[PDB]
Ligand binder design. Structure first.
Ligand code: CHL
Ligand code: CLA
Ligand code: CLA
Ligand code: CLA
Ligand code: CLA
Ligand code: CLA
Ligand code: CLA
Ligand code: XAT
Ligand code: LUT
Ligand code: LUT
Ligand code: LUT
Ligand code: 13X
Lengths: 74, 221, 229, 231, 160, 41, 74
């Protein structure tokens, strides 16, 4: 279930597709927060026209090594 | 004994479903009516849902037929918006409040009847609103309310065989109408057209007009 | 019974052999129910008699009017004219619907309760003596071809009806696959059987997708998904 | 009895020993299963029979005497000697009085049998739905056969009125006019000749009645009875 | 493939292969059916659901499947002691194998033929993946040159 | 069904459901009425 | 990334995969003939890291997984 959640978040709330085109400047992000009490500030400008929390789990690198490329595969 | 929702397999048939209830086929794999009071509540909910679904489906079908003929009758998925547009003097909140209040009055009458089977057949109401019972061996109240107002033609008054046949007709039609409303919602969400529209487009071209060609059920197709 | 449809098959218990044409068939068990067996027997008699009339009519019209194809003999432009009245398929359907409805309701009522509608609605004295279901007799048997061995004649009728049903299915498939009449198909096969058989004709639907009947479009289709000519 | 709506069938249990006139055992839905409901429906059927007979006779006579006036639109094209409002009010008042008396007589047999103005006059004892006395000063034959005749003629009149309204909505002509039109071409004037539905196409005859009619200063709907449901 | 190789059907031998009928769209598909394969699978799922579920219920309860009404067909669903051999009025129309010894012999024939067919199906799948052709084509090519056309000779080209 | 409803009535299940309902209500109150520093009536 | 062929186009097409790795034009024949050296293009033992991505050579990882798989199976 945890793995499914990781893949789903990387496929719907991430910038993996944009990160593939620029993996050295775009910071990986796979979490988006809702705007409720000013917490939307946590949605950093990671890059590629995306806003979210910077992740450090290394899932983007793993997926790239596996040749995921697209979000449909995730 | 009686026909089951799955020929053979008496293990899946629950013990509380002995066949006395109308429309009983031993269907309850999840055991949602294991408790007696829960079973009674579910019986009331099922008959109410069937009647409501039949009324809604009949209205939707008639409005769709009128819309196809050229009448100024909008579709079911847009009837509310259309009516609100042609009547700009009717506040939406006011209509919602009025609907909730009137429905609350009748629903509270029915609710008190559910709590006390024969408590609404007096006071500001005649004995006709007391109910005839049926489920769980009850002889008063329940979803089957006889009288001269909820049964003016007296179809359930006289010959128990006719009453049983009509009760089975009602429950079967209610279940069919519930499934029909579910299909209406799914078809509208997949194709974006009404029921009659889908039926005529399918009859005109049987193959190439199935759920696989709507682009929603089968995403890659 | 004695001889069955297949060598060594076990005839079902309910197929004793009393009924005409009983060859111990019924591999689906549709006759295990007595009431359903009676209804199916009535349906078999009706289908066999109608198939006999249809096959005889198709063959007769092909012999007398070979220029007209039985498959398309129903279009309004091919309907023979006997008077100056206009051609209206709806009007013709009205007569047939009313008369057929009346006669079929009478037969149905007889099936429900035997000898219940055996009397004339106007003259109670005039009665139809039907010894069994599907065999009214009386006015329906003016020549009196019964009286004698009734079971033998019944067997002949049921066998002829079954043969006619098979023949009608054959006529339909042959017309949809070749676009000709049964006699025409038989003649063509006798000329070049190696090149005019079911192997070459099958897979072709020689019938248009739809037909225009005085404005009304009737969707047409073969009995099997052919190549649409 | 031997007179059955379906020869060879069996009369329903509630319709057995049925003493009502014109009782041929027709009740597939069992609407007459209840005894009280059966009597109420009998009174309703008798009143419908008489009203339909009067209406059909009036429509036929109006068409014969005045063939240039459409019975369907006669409500708004006749030129009333009085006013529509006053006429409707007067009719409603008198109809309320007579209908209330009749309905109460059905609910309670001898409750509405005395003259309120002249105490000396009183309707003699009778059966529900058949007043008699001053209402039947001439009876040519036995009452039972005449009752059967009345019920049968009333049923035929109801069917005739429905046919009249449907023919007026489909053809826009009067009863005899539609009959003459059908006689000039029987194979082309039937409902099967104008309407037909098939899996893929449907032919629906156009409405011969205007969508709306203008009466006085307002507009009245008056269209077609479920045109979208027409074949 | 055999009928197409002889020209009996209007399909080329390379188009009549079993893995190109539409079962695997990537490997090829026949787009001339009366309706698309997905809807065909929908009908297939409903029909097979009915048949397989009734068979399973009979396996669980041998006496069932012949009690509930099923358009009159339930009269031939009584089965027998062995779930694999119902052979009633329909499953054993011709009444073949009247004696127990004859039935045992026929059952042995059925088991041996089925095992050979299982092995053959697996072989057909493997050959199709490694030769990209049909079973009949593989057999003919092997007959033409057996020393060259075989498993060892086809190792160089497996998906070409 | 009775046992299931009894399990749903246990202290942990009821505590989590009550906390979730209260948190959801507060979140929606702050979503529709945000930045409520004082009780301005 | 949107221009690279899909994974199945590489898994079931030895021609394209051969265009990327020429040793694949020989199929599985070298593996069964004990001439594994032919597979040295995609089964390397380089070392270090890929100068473009900064990670280990995927060919080296493939060779590593194959070797450990044989060892574990034995
Ligand atoms: C009691 C039976 C009775 C029957 C069967 C009819 C039938 C008819 N009237 Mg009539 N009327 C009747 C009584 C009376 N009308 C009128 C006064 C009128 C007028 C002024 C008009 C009609 C019209 C009509 C027609 C409306 C068609 C339609 O679809 O309307 C749909 C139904 C409604 C709009 C009314 C719905 C509510 C109503 C039943 C109460 C129709 C054929 C109209 C016409 O000519 O149409 C062509 C018309 O303009 N009627 C009076 C007062 C003297 C009546 C008194 O008894
Ligand atoms: C297993 C680990 C895991 C974790 C830690 C998370 C964590 C999160 N998810 Mg996620 N999710 C997961 C698995 C996981 N998910 C899986 C397996 C799926 C596929 C079904 C999803 C599908 C999913 C969607 C579609 C969404 C999230 C969202 C979220 C975020 C807000 C969730 C929330 O508060 O909603 C509400 C809290 C509730 C208690 C109500 C939940 C009601 C559901 C229906 C209960 C289902 C049981 C949050 C950070 C949301 C998000 O990312 O916001 C941008 C969002 O929309 N998740
Ligand atoms: C909300 C409508 C509703 C309700 C309240 C009931 C209630 C009842 N049904 Mg019934 N049924 C329904 C709809 C409903 N049914 C429909 C539409 C059909 C046609 C498929 C049937 C067919 C049916 C049969 C054949 C039988 C019953 C029977 C029963 C009784 C025993 C079952 C039980 O106790 O579980 C109670 C049921 C519920 C509490 C409903 C739970 C709904 C779940 C939680 C949601 C999931 C539904 C669906 C799979 C997801 C779609 C939702 C989404 C797409 C929006 C009971 C009183 C049995 C009986 O003895 O009759 C008296 C029986 O034999 N039902
Ligand atoms: C169970 C075997 C089988 C199956 C599943 C099919 C299936 C199919 N055949 Mg085929 N056919 C078969 C046997 C079969 N055939 C045999 C044995 C012959 C030799 C006579 C033919 C000769 C044949 C021809 C000439 C054509 C087809 C065609 C077709 C396709 C369209 C259906 C049609 O109209 O043709 C006819 C249906 C049948 C012949 C079924 C009869 C087979 C036996 C008797 C019953 C099963 C279809 C997918 C058509 C096609 O290729 O589409 C482009 C086509 O023109 N078939
Ligand atoms: C060569 C393979 C083979 C063999 C030897 C058998 C043998 C047997 N089967 Mg079996 N069967 C097979 C294939 C085979 N089957 C396949 C592929 C299926 C899947 C459809 C079945 C499904 C099946 C069922 C469901 C049942 C049997 C039963 C039986 C037993 C009954 C006796 C019998 O009919 O003999 C078999 C005779 C032959 C194999 C010779 C026929 C060979 C030709 C080519 C077949 C032509 C059939 C054709 C469609 C005929 C159509 C018209 C026809 C009705 C006149 C018997 C031991 C029944 C049983 O268990 O009895 C208690 C039973 O219940 N079979
Ligand atoms: C005793 C400590 C305390 C107090 C008095 C407050 C008081 C307040 N906080 Mg705060 N807060 C606290 C602790 C506290 N907080 C802590 C520990 C955190 C870290 C999690 C936060 C994080 C926080 C955030 C992020 C925010 C607030 C906000 C607010 C204000 C919003 C009032 C409101 O919700 O509208 C009215 C609510 C109601 C009328 C509901 C009343 C009925 C409830 C349901 C009854 C509950 C029964 C149990 C309010 C003045 C919000 C604000 O806008 O600041 C001004 C806001 O954005 N707080
Ligand atoms: C489990 C890992 C695995 C899998 C699934 C595959 C699968 C595949 N490889 Mg591959 N390969 C692998 C590991 C694997 N390889 C390794 C570790 C190496 C390095 C030595 C290679 C080197 C290699 C080369 C050089 C080539 C392939 C090729 C292929 C494709 C066709 C070969 C084949 O025999 O069909 C599928 C294989 C199986 C289904 C295995 C089934 C096992 C037996 C044989 C069948 C069942 C047992 C039997 C009944 C007894 C195929 C999709 C060929 C290709 O087409 O390129 C794309 C090709 O030329 N492989
Ligand atoms: C009430 C209902 C529909 C009513 C619709 C109405 C009023 C529509 C109203 C309007 O349209 C009009 C007229 C006009 C429009 O302009 C506006 C709206 C307002 C839209 C459908 C219910 C629909 C209800 C449905 C479909 C219920 C299905 C339940 C099922 C199948 C449950 C099965 C089982 O529960 C059992 C029985 C046993 C368990 O153990 C196992 C499982 C399997 C869980
Ligand atoms: C026995 C059994 C039992 C088991 O158990 C099971 C099973 C197997 C199911 C079984 C079997 C069955 C079968 C075989 C069936 C079949 C049938 C048929 C064929 C019918 C037809 C049937 C047929 C028919 C009626 C037909 C008829 C016909 C007709 C009228 C015709 C008409 C016509 C004509 C004149 C001419 C013109 O121009 C055209 C038309 C119009 C066209
Ligand atoms: C019995 C039963 C039982 C079972 O069980 C079931 C079922 C089936 C349901 C059933 C049946 C039913 C039915 C059929 C019904 C119907 C009825 C009708 C038709 C009525 C009418 C009815 C009808 C009617 C009254 C009518 C009337 C009419 C009228 C008055 C008219 C009038 C008029 C005139 C003069 C003239 C002017 O200018 C116009 C007007 C004004 C218009
Ligand atoms: C049940 C019943 C009962 C009643 O009563 C009677 C009756 C009717 C008789 C019945 C039925 C029966 C049946 C169905 C039968 C069928 C069978 C079959 C189909 C077999 C096959 C069977 C089949 C089989 C073995 C098959 C085999 C195969 C093979 C070897 C193959 C081989 C191969 C391969 C690998 C590949 C290569 O590249 C080529 C080749 C060389 C070609
Ligand atoms: O709907 C009604 C029934 C009844 O018996 C009397 C009445 O006046 C109205």
């Amino acid at each position: 279930i945890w793995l499914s959640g990781m893949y789903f978040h990387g496929a719907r709330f991430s910038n993996y597709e944009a990160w593939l085109t620029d993996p050295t400047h775009i910071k990986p992000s796979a979490q988006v927060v809702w705007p409720i009490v000013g917490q939307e500030i946590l949605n950093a400008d990671v890059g590629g026209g995306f806003q979210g929390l910077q992740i450090t789990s290394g899932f983007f690198q793993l997926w790239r090594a596996a040749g995921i490329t697209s979000e449909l595969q995730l | 004994v009686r026909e089951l929702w799955f020929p053979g397999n008496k293990e899946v048939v629950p013990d509380y479903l002995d066949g006395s209830l109308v429309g009983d086929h031993g269907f309850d794999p999840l055991g949602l009516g294991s408790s007696p009071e829960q079973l009674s509540w579910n019986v009331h909910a099922e008959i109410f849902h069937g009647r409501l679904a039949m009324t809604g489906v009949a209205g939707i079908l008639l409005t769709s037929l009128l819309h196809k003929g050229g009448a100024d009758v909008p579709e079911w998925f847009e009837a509310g918006r259309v009516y609100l547009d042609r009547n700009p003097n009717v506040d939406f909140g006011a209509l919602l409040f009025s609907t909730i209040v009137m429905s609350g009055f009748v629903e509270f009458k029915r609710l008190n009847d559910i709590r006390n089977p024969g408590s609404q057949g007096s006071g500001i109401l005649p004995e006709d609103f007391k109910g005839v019972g049926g489920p769980q061996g009850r002889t008063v109240g329940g979803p089957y309310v006889g009288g001269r107002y909820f049964d003016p033609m007296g179809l359930c008054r006289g010959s128990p065989e006719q009453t049983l046949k009509y009760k089975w007709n009602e429950i079967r039609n209610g279940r069919l109408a519930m499934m029909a409303f579910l299909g209406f919602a799914a078809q509208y969400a997949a194709t974006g057209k009404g029921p009659i529209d889908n039926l005529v487009d399918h009859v005109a071209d049987p193959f190439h007009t199935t759920f696989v060609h709507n682009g929603v059920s089968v995403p890659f197709i | 019974q004695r001889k069955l449809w297949f060598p060594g098959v076990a005839a079902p218990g309910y197929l004793d052999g009393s009924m005409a044409g009983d060859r111990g068939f019924d591999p689906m068990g549709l006759g295990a129910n007595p009431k359903m067996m009676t209804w199916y027997r009535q349906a078999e008699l009706q289908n066999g008699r109608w198939a006999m009339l249809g096959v005889a009519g198709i063959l007769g019209q092909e012999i007398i009017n070979p220029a007209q194809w039985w498959y398309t003999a129903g279009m309004p432009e091919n309907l023979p004219r006997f008077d100056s009245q206009p051609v209206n398929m709806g009007g013709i359907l009205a007569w047939e619907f009313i008369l057929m409805h009346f006669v079929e309701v009478r037969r149905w009522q007889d099936i429900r309760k035997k000898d219940s509608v055996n009397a004339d609605p106007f003259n109670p004295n005039l009665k139809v003596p039907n010894p069994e279901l599907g065999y009214p007799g009386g006015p329906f048997d003016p020549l009196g071809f019964s009286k004698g061995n009734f079971k033998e004649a019944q067997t002949k009728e049921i066998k002829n009806g079954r043969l006619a049903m098979v023949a009608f299915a054959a006529f339909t498939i042959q017309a949809q696959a070749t676009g000709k009449g049964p006699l025409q198909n038989l003649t063509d096969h006798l000329s070049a059987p190696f090149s005019n058989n079911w192997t070459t004709n099958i897979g072709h639907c020689m019938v248009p997708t739809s037909v225009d009947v005085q404005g009304l479009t009737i969707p047409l289709s073969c009995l099997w998904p052919g190549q649409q000519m | 009895a031997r007179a059955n709506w379906l020869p060879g069938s069996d009369f329903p249990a509630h319709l057995e020993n049925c003493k009502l006139p014109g009782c041929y055992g027709f009740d597939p839905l069992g609407l007459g299963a209840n005894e009280e409901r059966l009597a109420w429906f009998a009174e309703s059927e008798r009143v419908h029979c008489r009203w339909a007979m009067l209406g059909v006779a009036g429509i036929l006579v109006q068409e014969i005497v005045k063939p240039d006036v459409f019975w369907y639109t006669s409500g708004a094209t006749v030129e009333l000697p009085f006013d529509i409002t006053g006429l409707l009010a007067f009719e409603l008042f008198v109809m309320h009085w007579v209908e209330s008396r009749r309905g109460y007589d059905i609910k309670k047999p001898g409750s509405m049998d005395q003259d309120p103005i002249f105490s000396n006059f009183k309707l003699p004892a009778h059966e529900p739905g058949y007043p008699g006395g001053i209402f039947a000063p001439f009876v040519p034959g036995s009452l039972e056969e005449l009752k059967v005749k009345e019920i049968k003629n009333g049923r035929l009149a109801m069917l005739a009125f429905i046919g009249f309204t449907m023919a007026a909505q489909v053809t826009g002509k009067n009863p005899l006019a539609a009959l003459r039109e059908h006689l000039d071409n029987p194979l082309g004037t039937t409902i099967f000749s104008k309407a037909v539905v098939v899996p893929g196409q449907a032919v629906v005859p156009p409405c011969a009645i205007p969508d709306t009619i203008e009466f006085q200063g307002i507009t009245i709907p008056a269209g077609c009875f479920l045109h979208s449901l027409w074949p | 493939e055999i009928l197409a190789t002889a020209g009996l059907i209007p399909a080329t031998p390379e188009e009549a292969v079993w893995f190109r009928s539409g079962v695997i769209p990537p490997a090829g598909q026949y787009g001339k059916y009366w309706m698309d394969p997905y809807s065909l699978f929908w009908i297939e799922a409903i029909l097979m659901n009915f048949a397989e579920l009734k068979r399973w219920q009979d396996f669980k309860e041998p006496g069932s499947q012949s009690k509930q009404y099923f358009l009159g067909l339930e009269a031939v669903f009584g089965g027998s002691g062995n779930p694999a051999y119902p052979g009633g009025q329909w499953f054993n129309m011709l009444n073949l194998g009247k004696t127990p010894e004859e039935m045992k012999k026929l059952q042995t024939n059925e088991i041996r033929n089925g095992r050979l067919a299982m092995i053959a199906c697996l072989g057909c799948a493997a050959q199709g993946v490694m030769t990209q052709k049909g079973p009949f084509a593989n057999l003919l090519e092997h007959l033409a040159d057996p020393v060259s056309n075989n498993l060892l000779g086809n190792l160089a080209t497996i998906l070409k | 069904m009775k046992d299931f409803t009894t399990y749903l009535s246990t202290a942990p299940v009821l505590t989590l459901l009550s906390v979730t309902v209260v948190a959801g209500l507060l979140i929606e109150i702050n979503r529709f009425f945000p930045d409520a520093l004082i009780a301005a009536f | 990334p949107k221009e690279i062929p899909l994974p199945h186009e590489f898994t079931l097409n030895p021609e394209l995969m051969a265009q990327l790795y020429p040793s694949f034009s020989k199929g599985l024949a070298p593996f069964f003939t004990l001439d594994w050296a032919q597979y040295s293009d995609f089964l390397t033992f380089q070392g270090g890291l890929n100068p473009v991505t900064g990670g280990l050579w995927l060919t080296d990882t493939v060779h590593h997984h194959l070797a450990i798989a044989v060892l574990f199976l034995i």
